[PDB]
C-alpha cells in the first residue's frame, strides 16, 4: 500500500531560538503530500538521503532499526535496539540475520550472530516520527511522540520534530531495516529531499506552521 | 628477563607506555579540557559561549528558550541572547554604548567657548543636561523660550547669550 | 577637533560632527560546558601488572 | 476610522533598505567567512 | 642594506616576504612590506 503525508516530517533545523517571525530555511525535507509506502505486520529498504519514519501502536512491536551499507561483517554498520529494558546503541561489525527479530519466557533477540570490533557502545495509540540524516560524519536523530485517537493510521495534522541524538561515527550508509516483537505467547517510510521551506515561529519559540514553496504558485 | 632487586640500574625492569595519536578522516574525537571563567554582567566584556563570539553587555532576561535551543536572533539575524553552558540560565546581549559626539560653536569669531552633544547616549556612561538627542556637557539650561539659534534637535536649540 | 575637520583657522557659527565615540570592553569571559569524561588514564598509568 | 498608503509607502521603503543594509553584513563575496575573526583565527596576516 | 650569512640548504624559501619557519620566525625576518632582493649560492666548499 501507499498513503499520503499531509504536513509531516518537520524538524528543527538549528539550535536557533526565534520569536514570532517566518524564518525561511533550504535544507533536507519531506515535501508536502508526498507518496509514503505503507508497511504491515519486514524487507530491506534504501536510504539514498535521510528517511522519515513514523509509528503507530499501543504495545511496542516496532523495536529499532539496524543500518549500514551492507548489513554484514567486511564493513560497519550501527545498531539501535531496545529491549523491554531501554535503548542500546551500538556500532560493530555485525553479522545479521537476513531475517532479524526478536522474540516475546520473553526469550529474543535472534537478530544477529556477530559483534566483532566494537567502535561505539552505549546502554542504560500512539504515534512515533523519527527523522533520520547523516552528514558530515555525524548521525542526526530528530523524533516526536504525539499521542493519536486511533490506532493504527497516519492522521493529519502538524508536529515539528526535536532533535534528539548526534553521534560522530564516520559510518557509510546506503540501506536500512527494521526490528518487531513476534508472536509466541503498521509503519511508513518517506525520504527527503533538499527542499525550501518558510516556518512560522511561535512567541515561545516553537514551529507552528509551514509552507512548502515547491508545491503550487500559491505557496 | 629473570629480574632481581639486587640488579644494578640499566637492569632494573621500567614499565612503558607509548601513546599514538592518531587522525583517520572522521569527523572529530577527543580533545584537551576547555577552561573557563566566571560570568561578569552589565558590564561591556568580550563574551565566547562554545564558539558564539562577541562583544557587549550581558543581562539577565525574561526569555524561555527550548530545552534543545542554544542561542536566540532577531529579525536580521543578529544574536540578540544566549544560553550559558553551565548555569541553564539565558542572558540578554546589549551592544555597548556607542555615538556621534557633536560641537556647538558661538562662532570662533565670537568666543572659543564650546558646547558638547553626546547622541543618544544616557549621560552617565560619558552643567550637565539630558536632552532626547542625547546628553550635552558645557551648557546651560534656561527656562525661556526664544527663536531657534543653533538646532540640537527633539525640540531644544543653544544660543550664546549674557557671557555663556 | 573642530579645526581639524574643517580644515580652518576659523570656524563659524553651527553644530559640527566631529568625531564617534564607543565604550571600550573592560575584560574578556569564557563559558564552557561543564566536565564529566575525564577520561581516566589511572588505569594504564596505573595497572597492578 | 473604519486610505494612507502613500505615507505607509515611504516608511516601508526605508525599512525595506535599511534591512536590506543589515542582511548584507552576512555574505562572503568570495572569501573563507564573513567574520573578521574567523579570517584572524584561521589565516596568517599575510 | 646588505645582510650576509649562511644557513642550510633547507630553508632558502625561508627568507621571502612573509611567512612562517623555524628559521623565519626565531632567527631572522622580513617584513612583509619587503622591497630588495635575495641571492643564494651553495657553499660547502669554503
Ligand atoms: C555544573 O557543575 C556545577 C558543579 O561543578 C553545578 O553547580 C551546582 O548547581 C546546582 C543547581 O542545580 C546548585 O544547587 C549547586 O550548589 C551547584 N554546585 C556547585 C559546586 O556549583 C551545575 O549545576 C552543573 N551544571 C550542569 C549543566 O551540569
Ligand atoms: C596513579 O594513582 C596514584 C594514586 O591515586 C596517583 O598518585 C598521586 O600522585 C599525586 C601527584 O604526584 C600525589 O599528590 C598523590 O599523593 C598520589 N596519590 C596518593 C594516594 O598518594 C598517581 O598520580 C596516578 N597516576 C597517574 C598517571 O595519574
Ligand atoms: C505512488 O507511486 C506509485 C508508483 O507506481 C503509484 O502507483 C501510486 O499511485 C502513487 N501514490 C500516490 C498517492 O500518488
Ligand atoms: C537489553 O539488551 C542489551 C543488548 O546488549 C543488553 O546489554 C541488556 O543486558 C539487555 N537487558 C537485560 C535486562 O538483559
Ligand atoms: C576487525 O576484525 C577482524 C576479525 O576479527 C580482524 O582481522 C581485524 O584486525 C579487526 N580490525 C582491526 C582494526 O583490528
Ligand atoms: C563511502 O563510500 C564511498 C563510495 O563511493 C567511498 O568513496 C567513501 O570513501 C566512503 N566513506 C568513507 C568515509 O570512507
Ligand atoms: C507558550 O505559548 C502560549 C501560547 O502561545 C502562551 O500562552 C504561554 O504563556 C507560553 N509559555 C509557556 C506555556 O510557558
Ligand atoms: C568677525 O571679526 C571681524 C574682525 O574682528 C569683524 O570685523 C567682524 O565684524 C566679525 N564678524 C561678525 C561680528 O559677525
Ligand atoms: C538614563 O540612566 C538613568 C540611570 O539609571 C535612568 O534612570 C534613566 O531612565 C536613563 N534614561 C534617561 C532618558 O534618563
Ligand atoms: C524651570 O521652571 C520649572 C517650573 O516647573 C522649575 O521647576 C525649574 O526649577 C525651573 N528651572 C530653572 C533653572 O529655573
Known amino acids: 500500500a501507499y498513503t499520503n503525508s499531509f504536513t509531516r516530517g518537520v524538524y528543527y533545523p538549528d539550535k536557533v531560538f526565534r520569536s514570532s517571525v517566518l524564518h525561511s530555511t533550504q535544507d533536507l525535507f519531506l515535501p508536502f503530500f508526498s507518496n509514503v509506502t505503507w508497511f504491515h505486520a519486514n524487507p530491506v529498504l534504501p536510504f539514498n538521503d535521510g528517511v522519515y519514519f513514523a509509528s503507530t501502536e499501543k504495545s511496542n512491536i516496532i523495536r529499532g532499526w539496524i543500518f549500514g551499507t551492507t548489513l554484514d561483517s567486511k564493513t560497519q554498520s550501527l545498531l539501535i535496539v531496545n ?45 512515533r516520527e523519527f ?8 548521525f542526526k536523530i530528530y523524533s516526536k511522540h504525539t499521542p493519536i485517537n486511533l490506532v493504527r493510521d497516519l492522521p493529519q495534522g502538524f508536529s ?20 518487531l516483537a513476534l508472536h509466541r505467547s503498521a509503519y511508513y517510510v518517506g525520504y527527503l529531499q533538499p527542499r525550501t521551506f518558510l516556518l512560522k515561529y511561535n512567541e515561545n519559540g516553537t514551529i507552528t506552521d509551514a509552507v512548502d514553496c515547491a508545491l503550487d504558485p500559491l505557496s | ?54 562583544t557587549g553587555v550581558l543581562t539577565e532576561s525574561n526569555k524561555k528558550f527550548l530545552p534543545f535551543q542554544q542561542f536566540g536572533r532577531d529579525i536580521a539575524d543578529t544574536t540578540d541572547a544566549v544560553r550559558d553552558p553551565q548555569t541553564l540560565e539565558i542572558l540578554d546581549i546589549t551592544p555597548c554604548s556607542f555615538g556621534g559626539v557633536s560641537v556647538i560653536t558661538p562662532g570662533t569669531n565670537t568666543s572659543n567657548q564650546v558646547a558638547v552633544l553626546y547622541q543618544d547616549v544616557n549621560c552617565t556612561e560619558v552643567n550637565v543636561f539630558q536632552t532626547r538627542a542625547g546628553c550635552l556637557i558645557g551648557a546651560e539650561h534656561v527656562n525661556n523660550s526664544y527663536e531657534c539659534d543653533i538646532p540640537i534637535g527633539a525640540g531644544i536649540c543653544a544660543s550664546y547669550q549674557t557671557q555663556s | 577637533e573642530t579645526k581639524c575637520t574643517l580644515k ?42 | 476610522s473604519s486610505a494612507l498608503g502613500k505615507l505607509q509607502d515611504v516608511v516601508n521603503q526605508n525599512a525595506q533598505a535599511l534591512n536590506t543594509l543589515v542582511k548584507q553584513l552576512s555574505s562572503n563575496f568570495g572569501a573563507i567567512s564573513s567574520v573578521l575573526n574567523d579570517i584572524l583565527s584561521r589565516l596568517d596576516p599575510p | 642594506y646588505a645582510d650576509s650569512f649562511v644557513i642550510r640548504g633547507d630553508e632558502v624559501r625561508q627568507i621571502a616576504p612573509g611567512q612562517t619557519g623555524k628559521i623565519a620566525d626565531y632567527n631572522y625576518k622580513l617584513p612583509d612590506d619587503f622591497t630588495g632582493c635575495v641571492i643564494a649560492w651553495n657553499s660547502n666548499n669554503l
Not at chain 2, 6 to 14: C, E, I, K, L
Not at chain 3, 24 to 47: D, H, K, M, W, Y
Request: aromatic letters at 14%.
Open chain 3, 8 to 49: 580652518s583657522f576659523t570656524v563659524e557659527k553651527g553644530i559640527y560632527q566631529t568625531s564617534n565615540f564607543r565604550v571600550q570592553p573592560t575584560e574578556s569571559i569564557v563559558r564552557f560546558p561543564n566536565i564529566t569524561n575525564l577520561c581516566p588514564f589511572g588505569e594504564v598509568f596505573n595497572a597492578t601488572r
Open chain 1, 131 to 138: 527523522v533520520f540524516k547523516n552528514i558530515d560524519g555525524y
Open chain 2, 1 to 54: 628477563y629473570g629480574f632481581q632487586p639486587t640488579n644494578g640500574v640499566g637492569y632494573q625492569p621500567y614499565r612503558v607506555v607509548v601513546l599514538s595519536f592518531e587522525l583517520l578522516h572522521a569527523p572529530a574525537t577527543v580533545c584537551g579540557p576547555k577552561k573557563s571563567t566566571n560570568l561578569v554582567k552589565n558590564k561591556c566584556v568580550n563574551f565566547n559561549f562554545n564558539g558564539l563570539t562577541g
Open chain 1, 160 to 179: 515539528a520534530l526535536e532533535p534528539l541524538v548526534d553521534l560522530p561515527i564516520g559510518i557509510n550508509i546506503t540501506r536500512f531495516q527494521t526490528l
Open chain 1, 83 to 127: 529491549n523491554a529494558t531501554n535503548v542500546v546503541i551500538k556500532v560493530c561489525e555485525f553479522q545479521f540475520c537476513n531475517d532479524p527479530f526478536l522474540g516475546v519466557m520473553e526469550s529474543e533477540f535472534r537478530v544477529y550472530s556477530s559483534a566483532n570490533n566494537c567502535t561505539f557502545e552505549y546502554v542504560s495509540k500512539n504515534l
